[PDB]
Amino acid sequence: LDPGLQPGQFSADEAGAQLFAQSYQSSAEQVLFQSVAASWAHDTNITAENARRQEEAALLSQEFAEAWGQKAKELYEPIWQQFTDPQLRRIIGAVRTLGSANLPLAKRQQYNALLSQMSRIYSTAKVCLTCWSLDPDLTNILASSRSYAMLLFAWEGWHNAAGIPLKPLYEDFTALSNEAYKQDGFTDTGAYWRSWYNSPTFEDDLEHLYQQLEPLYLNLHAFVRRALHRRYGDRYINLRGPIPAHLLGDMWAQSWENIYDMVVPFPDKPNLDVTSTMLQQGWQATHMFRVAEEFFTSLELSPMPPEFWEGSMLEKPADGREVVCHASAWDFYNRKDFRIKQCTRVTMDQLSTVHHEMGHIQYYLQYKDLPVSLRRGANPGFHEAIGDVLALSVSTPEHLHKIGLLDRVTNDTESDINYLLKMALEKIAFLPFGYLVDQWRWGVFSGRTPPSRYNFDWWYLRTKYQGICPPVTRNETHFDAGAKFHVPNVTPYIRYFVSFVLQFQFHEALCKEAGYEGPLHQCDIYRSTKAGAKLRKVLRAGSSRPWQEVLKDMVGLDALDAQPLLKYFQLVTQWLQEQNQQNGEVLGWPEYQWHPPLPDNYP
Numbered sequence: 336l337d338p339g340l341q342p343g344q345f346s347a348d349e350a351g352a353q354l355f356a357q358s359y360q361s362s363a364e365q366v367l368f369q370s371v372a373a374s375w376a377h378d379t380n381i382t383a384e385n386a387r388r389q390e391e392a393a394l395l396s397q398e399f400a401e402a403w404g405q406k407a408k409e410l411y412e413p414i415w416q417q418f419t420d421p422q423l424r425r426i427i428g429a430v431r432t433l434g435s436a437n438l439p440l441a442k443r444q445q446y447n448a449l450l451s452q453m454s455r456i457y458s459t460a461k462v463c464l465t466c467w468s469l470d471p472d473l474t475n476i477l478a479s480s481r482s483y484a485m486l487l488f489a490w491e492g493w494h495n496a497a498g499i500p501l502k503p504l505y506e507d508f509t510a511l512s513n514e515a516y517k518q519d520g521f522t523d524t525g526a527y528w529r530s531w532y533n534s535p536t537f538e539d540d541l542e543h544l545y546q547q548l549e550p551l552y553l554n555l556h557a558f559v560r561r562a563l564h565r566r567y568g569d570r571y572i573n574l575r576g577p578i579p580a581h582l583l584g585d586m587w588a589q590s591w592e593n594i595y596d597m598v599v600p601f602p603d604k605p606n607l608d609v610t611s612t613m614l615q616q617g618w619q620a621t622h623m624f625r626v627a628e629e630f631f632t633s634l635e636l637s638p639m640p641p642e643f644w645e646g647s648m649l650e651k652p653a654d655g656r657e658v659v660c661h662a663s664a665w666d667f668y669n670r671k672d673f674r675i676k677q678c679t680r681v682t683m684d685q686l687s688t689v690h691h692e693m694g695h696i697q698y699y700l701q702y703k704d705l706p707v708s709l710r711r712g713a714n715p716g717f718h719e720a721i722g723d724v725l726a727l728s729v730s731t732p733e734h735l736h737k738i739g740l741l742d743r744v745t746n747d748t749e750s751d752i753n754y755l756l757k758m759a760l761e762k763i764a765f766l767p768f769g770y771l772v773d774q775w776r777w778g779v780f781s782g783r784t785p786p787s788r789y790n791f792d793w794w795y796l797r798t799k800y801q802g803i804c805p806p807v808t809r810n811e812t813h814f815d816a817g818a819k820f821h822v823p824n825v826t827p828y829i830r831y832f833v834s835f836v837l838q839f840q841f842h843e844a845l846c847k848e849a850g851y852e853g854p855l856h857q858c859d860i861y862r863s864t865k866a867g868a869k870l871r872k873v874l875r876a877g878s879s880r881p882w883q884e885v886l887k888d889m890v891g892l893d894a895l896d897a898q899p900l901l902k903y904f905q906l907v908t909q910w911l912q913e914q915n916q917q918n919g920e921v922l923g924w925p926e927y928q929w930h931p932p933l934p935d936n937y938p
């Protein structure tokens with residue numbers, strides 16, 4: 336580690352800790368910059384060489400964390416809990432948690448290489464018998480094929496190709512991660528991840544929110560199951576069991592918008608999926624991003640800077656190079672460079688993802704003046720909610736009409752139910768998977784889920800929460816969790832469950848602040864400068880204040896609350912109950928052990 340990046344002398348009291356924190360944050364910018372730069376170079380161009388480079392940057396980061404976290408331990412380990420400035424307490428708390436820097440060199444190197452190699456296996460896996468990659472080929476199959484056998488072939492081929500080889504690596508990663516966080520005083524990695532919410536009743540509150548949301552999911556599930564039954568027959572669909580996991584329009588069954596054209600109740604009304612309009616008008620990736628940007632600027636938030644347009648990767652490179660195609664947002668920590676890396680396809684749900692990633696960028700633009708350690712969302716759920724809120728407005732039929740993507744819709748109940756149902760497929764169907772992924776990973780970190788039970792515990796939670804089953808037999812050689820991006824990429828997941836609830840609370844508050852007075856699901860905050868000022872206050876805070884206070888200021892309440900969500904979907908919730916009652920559906924899947932048979936002559 337460059338001497339210039341090592342800590343100097345500081346007094347062992349609050350005033351010395353303020354100086355300590357300023358010199359920490361100053362040198363941390365350069366180290367963060369070189370790390371994110373090496374990751375960028377790798378993720379947009381996966382090679383052994385770029386992997387070695389990102390591992391070197393990781394090692395430097397770890398030496399930095401060690402030098403500074405040990406100094407904080409030496410100076411402030413006694414007293415930092417007594418510091419009367421709450422923000423300093425937080426900055427210093429964070430510095431004295433060293434994470435992987437608690438590891439010796441040889442372990443550091445093995446942790447870093449584990450992360451590289453897991454990343455490479457996920458993003459370079461392919462399904463053969465020419466070869467299909469996850470994005471766009473398998474994604475497009477899952478989304479649009481209505482052939483049971485072709486859907487099974489992609490689902491099984493992806494899970495085998497990604498999950499199987501990941502499993503030995505994931506086990507080693509888990510043990511090293513846990514050894515690292517345990518020396519900071521956490522029971523395991525999961526406990527460190529949960530600490531970000533600064534909330535003694537975190538797990539209980541989540542459980543409580545889930546209980547309010549579950550009836551909405553169960554009604555949605557049974558209505559969808561009924562449509563799949565008409566489309567695949569009694570042999571492949573059990574009206575009282577879990578739904579086969581490959582039939583819901585997405586590799587993970589994590590949101591169901593892609594099968595809207597199979598379940599829309601009034602398919603003679605104007606199609607609320609504008610994909611084919613975007614293709615007929617000639618939309619490209621760049622127009623997607625420019626349309627998202629203009630929404631943000633209509634709110635008087637910032638435009639994307641030049642460095643964003645010059646640096647971002649907005650489409651999959653044609654030049655025979657391996658990339659991480661999963662969409663992501665990037666802050667280089669230099670207050671200048673911010674980019675998105677997305678293999679953008681022209682579809683309406685991609686337009687959604689574009690707003691999602693740009694919400695991350697906007698956050699970065701809004702807090703780039705803060706000292707580095709405050710450059711985070713108020714909690715990780717806030718960072719995930721920002722672009723989702725704008726996408727709630729963008730998706731509304733009125734707004735799509737404003738942007739030339741739909742010829743105005745008559746404002747009838749049929750149009751309303753069509754729209755709310757499509758929104759339910761996107762948001763409500765996600766809720767169980769958002770909740771369950773970290774329940775799985777917290778169990779693995781805690782040791783409750785050893786490697787000999789990774790797949791058993793995974794499908795337990797998949798069936799418990801989503802009510803799906805694997806369409807082929809799985810065993811413990813399979814590692815189905817590892818075929819989901821965020822697992823080999825070690826990105827925590829509970830943020831997304833938090834987000835999908837928080838976004839409705841934000842939306843409600845923003846619509847009120849824009850003076851809108853219609854049904855909440857028909858609000859569009861476009862061009863509202865007062866909504867934009869209330870949003871801006873959140874983004875500019877970063878993590879400088881507890882999320883519970885930030886939320887109080889914004890929404891009038893200091894806790895997550897499912898009510899705004901329930902209010903947004905109220906009409907479809909009622910309609911769905913009525914449909915299911917009329918059809919005599921059983922809610923849930925009392926036939927928990929059922930699996931579909933294989934198709935004849937598979938494969």
Ligand SMILES: C[C@H](N[C@H](C(=O)O)[C@@H]1CCCN1C(=O)c1ccc(C(=O)O)cc1)C(=O)N1CCC[C@H]1C(=O)O
Pocket residue numbers: 661662663664665666688691692695718719821826831
């Ligand atoms: C496509 C969307 N992609 C993710 C994302 O944006 O979240 C990507 C990959 C995981 C993290 N991520 C970031 O881009 C990101 C970058 C930085 C930070 C930070 O500064 O802390 C946070 C996130 C997503 O997975 N999603 C969207 C909602 C559901 C979830 C999924 O598809 O499984």
Ligand SMILES: *[C@@H]1O[C@H](CO[C@@H]2O[C@@H](C)[C@@H](O)[C@@H](O)[C@@H]2O)[C@@H](O)[C@H](O)[C@H]1NC(C)=O
Pocket residue numbers: 733746747748749751853854857
């Ligand atoms: C749409 O109409 C609303 C009043 O009508 C109610 O909702 C519509 C969708 C019909 O289903 C009708 O039977 C309902 O009673 C107004 O509140 C609303 O502001 C209108 N929205 C817009 C944007 O025009």
Ligand SMILES: *[C@@H]1O[C@H](CO)[C@@H](O)[C@H](O)[C@H]1NC(C)=O
Pocket residue numbers: 380382383384385656
């Ligand atoms: C990808 O990085 C490697 C270095 O390993 C090299 O082939 C080349 O510089 C890069 N390709 C592009 C297009 O940047």
Ligand SMILES: *[C@@H]1O[C@H](CO)[C@@H](O)[C@H](O)[C@H]1NC(C)=O
Pocket residue numbers: 808809810811812813
């Ligand atoms: C798991 O399933 C595959 C394919 O059905 C099979 O080849 C393999 O034997 C299994 N692993 C174990 C331990 O059975």
Ligand SMILES: [Cl-]
Pocket residue numbers: 528531715716827828829830
């Ligand atoms: Cl999180």
Ligand SMILES: [Zn+2]
Pocket residue numbers: 691692695718719
């Ligand atoms: Zn995100």
